[PDB]
Amino acid sequence: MKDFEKLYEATTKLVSTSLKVKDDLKKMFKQNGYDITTDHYALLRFLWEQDGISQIDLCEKSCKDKSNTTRILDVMKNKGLIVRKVDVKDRRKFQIFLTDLGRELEEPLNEIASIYATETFKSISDEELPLFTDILDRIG
Amino acid sequence: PRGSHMKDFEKLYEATTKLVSTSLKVKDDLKKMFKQNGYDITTDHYALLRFLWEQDGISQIDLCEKSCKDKSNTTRILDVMKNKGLIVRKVDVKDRRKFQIFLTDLGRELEEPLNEIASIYATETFKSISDEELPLFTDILDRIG
């Protein structure tokens, strides 16, 4: 039926497809001169939707945890993509803002990611997307 | 690139996210599965042993290709697996540079009790997914890329 061999394959494919996809996309960013990771692009996506999100919300949005998200954010700050501000209401609590460089990169990075998305999913039909997704949702 | 039937980018992005967040939630779930249960063994240790139990005495080339992955990391974990006393290297009787990987005694004894655990975790992991869905999932994932 769905014996251990298949479940182990499934799990294995899921993890490796995920890794390949992150890594191919990062390579395509680098090929075009953008030295960013997939993690940076995801976080930037949140920020292009809503500037000045608190650190705290952003770690909840992240699909990652606080220690890993915070490290990733330091790198981005170091790359000049965002700044960190002492809050207008509080202290020990920051807001995360786009720099101009961070805003400038919406168009170009989203374009590269589109190109990468269309090719990577060319063999999949539109209608398979919610099936795939609803399976992933019910795993674990 | 293009076509007369394009998918919406946002949908592909959301699905890519779901793929990735789910892979992570799954690795998290499985992190301590041997350790909480009395075997000081990682996930990576385990996935390599699966290849070894299937093909004991495989070439470190074919293994690094089996693993897909980064050779130093594949190799680096191999190293802990030597140190823990799970595997060792004998040198391939073809070249003087090509290696071969072989399970230690623990390595072979560990098959049953570690597969037993992983089976029970896998079953749990996929318990709300149906029999027909499994090869569908799997076929989608193969076609991605």
Ligand SMILES: O=C(O)c1ccccc1O
């Ligand atoms: O990747 C693993 O080590 C694993 C563990 C338990 C069940 C399925 C799996 O692929």
Ligand SMILES: O=C(O)c1ccccc1O
């Ligand atoms: O969840 C992620 O880190 C991610 C990975 C690849 C593409 C888009 C993403 O949001």
